[PDB]
């Protein structure tokens, strides 16, 4: 969660693929921070 | 007049200067390891 | 008259202070671990 917010934030693209590997996931994908 | 004329114009590549530094800055965040900080 | 002139000055070294920056900006992607970014 908090990783993908992190990487998502800076562009590391790499990180950003691989968090997003699991299938039929979209919770984690649309979270809000604070 | 003409003091303060070229001092933009030495302001103005100043910037620019920084501009192209920002940029190279996010490269560093943009290619890097991080696996001590795993958060 | 005097106190753009010092500015001069006090903007010279400063910008020079970023160009020695600049330059090492660059040594950090000179230098660097990049192996999470296959890409």
Known sequence: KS????????GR???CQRL????????????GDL | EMEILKQ???LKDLTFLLEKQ???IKL???KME???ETE
């Open chain 2, 8 to 10: 933009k114009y030495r």
């Open chain 2, 22 to 24: 920002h940029e190279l």
């Open chain 2, 34 to 36: 991080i696996i001590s």
């Open chain 1, 13 to 15: 693209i790499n990180t």
């Open chain 1, 20 to 31: 997003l590997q699991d299938i039929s996931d979209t919770r984690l994908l649309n979270e």
């Open chain 2, 28 to 30: 560093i965040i943009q």
């Open chain 1, 3 to 10: 990783p993908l917010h992190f990487a998502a934030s800076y």
